[PDB]
Amino acid sequence: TYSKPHDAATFYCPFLYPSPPRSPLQFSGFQQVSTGPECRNETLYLLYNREGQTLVERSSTWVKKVIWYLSGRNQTILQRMPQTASKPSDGNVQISVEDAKIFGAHMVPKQTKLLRFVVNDGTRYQMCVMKLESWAHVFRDYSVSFQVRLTFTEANNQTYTFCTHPNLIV
Amino acid sequence: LVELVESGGGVVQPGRSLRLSCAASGFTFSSDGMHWVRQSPGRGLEWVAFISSDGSTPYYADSVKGRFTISRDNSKNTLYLQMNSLRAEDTAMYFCAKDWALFRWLRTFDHWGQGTLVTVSS
Amino acid sequence: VQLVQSGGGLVQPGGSLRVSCAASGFSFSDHDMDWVRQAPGKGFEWVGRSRNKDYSSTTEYAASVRGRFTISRHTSEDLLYLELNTVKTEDTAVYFCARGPHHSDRSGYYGGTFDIWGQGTMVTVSS
Amino acid sequence: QCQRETAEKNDYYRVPHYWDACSRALPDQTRYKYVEQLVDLTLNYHYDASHGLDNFDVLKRINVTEVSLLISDFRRQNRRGGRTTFNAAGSLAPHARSLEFSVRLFAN
Amino acid sequence: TRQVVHNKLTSCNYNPLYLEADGRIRCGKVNDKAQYLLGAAGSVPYRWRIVGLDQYLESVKKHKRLDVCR
Amino acid sequence: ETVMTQSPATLSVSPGGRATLSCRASQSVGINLAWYQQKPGQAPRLLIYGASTRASGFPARFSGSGSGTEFTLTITSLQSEDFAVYYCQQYNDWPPWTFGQGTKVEIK
Amino acid sequence: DIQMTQSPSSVSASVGDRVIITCRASQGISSWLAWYQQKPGRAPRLLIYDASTLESGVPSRFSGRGSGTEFTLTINSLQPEDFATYYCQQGNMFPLTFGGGTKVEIK
């Protein structure tokens, strides 16, 4: 047997007390199922995760945060940016202005990250940190730019470590 | 390759019945659902009916409810649709369509057959 | 493994000449192919290398011929080309195509020795 | 850039950064593969970061070997694509090594 | 360690050295690419569900222990 | 529950041009929108699924934008093989899966 | 770019004679040296590669030694087929440089 989304959402109806907030990172899809008088006209949302199971949730600030995040995850420009990176001199086919404005809204103008890693340098582990600086801009001409500056350093600006000069045979 | 071949579609007056069929190949016909979507010449698309993977639950459009009966044979990998008790409808092309579930309750038409033309008029 | 040459002959000063060779008994794409030349009564001189199908800059030349000679490969017919455009009098010699190291050999990108040569083609520059 | 038959006159001397300068260039297919992978991983992280989700799952996938080798290739020869739609470059200082790429796309 | 091997030839500036079977250690060439090349490396050794309450009870009565979230 | 409306009914784009065809949802559709291409006298073919992901057999020229209520299909460098009728459909409210009246893209 | 000094410049020996031939490179090349044989009128044939590896099909009498700026290649049991020209080739860096050729003739 297979039911219709309305039956699925109203299965647990009514919802009287709040649900635990969850992170958008865990969810992979969402569906808005509206109800009428049967559940005080409440708007339920069926949230699909990567483990193949549905979570019906009442509209809330965090649920909306999930909706907005999942909404923007699959925007075209995010998907085709790597394919544009693979194609060399002949590689570019223009993008739409609607995605340019969506990219602007979703992507923050600048982000900086420090990420620690350990590399095995013979018998010792050398801790080093990568300072990542990235810019995402949508100019007034609906042009989009993504700049990244990846940098590896030693925890105390030490020279000639094993994170700097890793000397790979290629 | 996935092929859906529609057959059994002719011309009847009102009150008579037509029985479309769709021969499915390229898939076990058991993993996914089948649908019917009609398109009247120069008009939009209209959903007609859906049958669940196990044929236990059928669904129909309000504009067609009561008249039609969808069926499937998971052993034969074949789809039928009996259009009993007919009437006035300009919708000409009936297309058999295979679906695909993105998630439990997220499924849409994935493949379409060449469709059979059905005209119903006295 | 066999290597058969073509081209060569006479060429008017400042003219052009094509020497090519076809490779059999081995995967022409999977090996780098160099050209070597012998002047009458002199030692050998290296002309250049064609890389082993994994590189975008596919040609290397000696400084004297770096600006005048072009090494190329066929799009799909497994042929090696060496075009001597605007040949000079000091380029008169017998040109052999040779096979270099395999793409799984580390040495081939930066150097190597050869192992098989073709029968050669005589290129004579005179008026 | 590195010109062998200049440094190897000596068996007991090598200039600073000789290895990375004189190192074998990356095969085109590995340069493109790694570039596509790194840009995808970092763009996915930037996206998550914008929404306030510091997604460690995307971060762990970054292989420092791939990026370091790209640094060697873009310092070796910088690359571009095009109104150039791509531009990458590598820098090597005694205290830090860095890679800076920029993929731009136009709508107008 | 990278310091001792560099000290074997400081003038190599952390560039690999080459040990011949004779025993002499020299400064390494990028193009010898052999195993006898000290101080180089092939790869870098770097190192950076909703369960219903009924499902929980059912998935806890079996494995009789308390903590079920590994 | 959600009737999908499309506009314009006919859009005249010169070859190789860019067409932005709109689809507006009467009621929330989230990201459950799919676009189908239908060339004359042929069965429809899935074109785009999700709000943006293009289905196999359609080149990168076709981009899918939109969220919530407004969705727009953008077709760049429109070649001869791109002139057909495009329908947008919602798969959020099930019975019935509603389509728009479609938009025809004709040569200018 | 790398000068090649071959010694001796010309040599004569009989069948059964021992010849040793040296080749010198201007700067040190580890082992990227090869030895070739040119029969008059023919194309060259590789004889020894990697300085010491004897190529299959070549008589086992050859044996290569040396390094740096001086390498040596012996021809222990001269055979009636051993009248030809032997040439050294440097493979450490581009451009490859070759010797003047060593003429081995019967006595």
Numbering used by the authors:
A (entry chain D): 45 to 214
B (entry chain H): 1 to 122
C (entry chain A): 2 to 52, 52A, 52B, 52C, 53 to 82, 82A, 82B, 82C, ...
D (entry chain E): 19 to 100, 104 to 129
E (entry chain C): 85 to 132, 142 to 163
F (entry chain L): 1 to 108
G (entry chain B): 1 to 107
Paper text:
The HCMV Pentamer, composed of gH, gL, UL128, UL130, and UL131A, enhances entry into epithelial, endothelial, and myeloid cells by interacting with the cell surface receptor neuropilin 2 (NRP2). This elongated heteropentamer mediates tropism for endothelial and epithelial cells by binding to neuropilin 2 (NRP2) and triggering the viral fusion protein, gB, to facilitate entry into host cells. HCMV-directed antibodies isolated from asymptomatic donors predominantly target the Pentamer, suggesting that Pentamer-specific antibodies may restrict viral dissemination, making Pentamer a target for the development of vaccines and immunotherapeutics.
The flexibility and elongated shape of the Pentamer necessitated focused refinements of the Fabs along with the domains making up their respective epitopes. Although it is possible that 2-18 and 2-25 compete with the C-terminal MAM domain, this seems unlikely based on the position of the C terminus of b2 (50). These mAbs both bind to the junction between ULs 128 and 131A, and although this epitope is directly adjacent to the NRP2-binding interface, the binding angles of 2-18 and 2-25 result in these two Fabs being directed away from the β sheet–rich face of the Pentamer that is responsible for engaging NRP2. Because the dimerization interface is formed by two copies of UL128, it is likely that the binding of 2-18 and 2-25 would prevent dimerization from taking place while still allowing NRP2 engagement to occur.
